[PDB]
Symmetry: C2
Subunit: 74 residues, 2 copies
């Protein structure tokens, strides 16, 4: 169950976590903030948005993935 | 105010809304679902997650961007 998920998720660590989104509203808001407030970390806020929404949709899987990624610190 | 935002957002329509996220938890959950449930629209769910989280963080800007993008239908 849980340990079945762990092996697959560790198989997915090996790859680059590039995630691509084609979304006009999100792009417009992010670009507006980038051009309007200096120093706006557009990519960080987009990652936060993705992580927040995805954790809300799939809380258990998101927590498992976060624990596996974190506990791969050393 | 609002009409100042409209001009910039219409300036940003011209570009491709490619949004890129480098996030290990979100990547792990999305790839787990892609490999585990057939027909999983990974990109659609990632876009939904980004839109949900970003609308929660910036509801007014997200609604403005969504209205501008929608009302550019014809």
């Amino acid at each position: 169950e849980e340990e079945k998920i762990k092996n697959d998720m560790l198989k997915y660590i090996e790859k680059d976590p590039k995630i691509g989104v084609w979304s006009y509203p999100a792009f417009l808001v992010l670009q507006y903030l980038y051009h309007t407030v200096p120093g706006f970390k557009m990519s960080r806020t987009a990652k936060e948005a993705l992580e927040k929404g995805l954790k809300e949709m799939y809380p258990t899987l998101f927590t498992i993935a976060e624990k596996i990624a974190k506990e791969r610190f050393k």
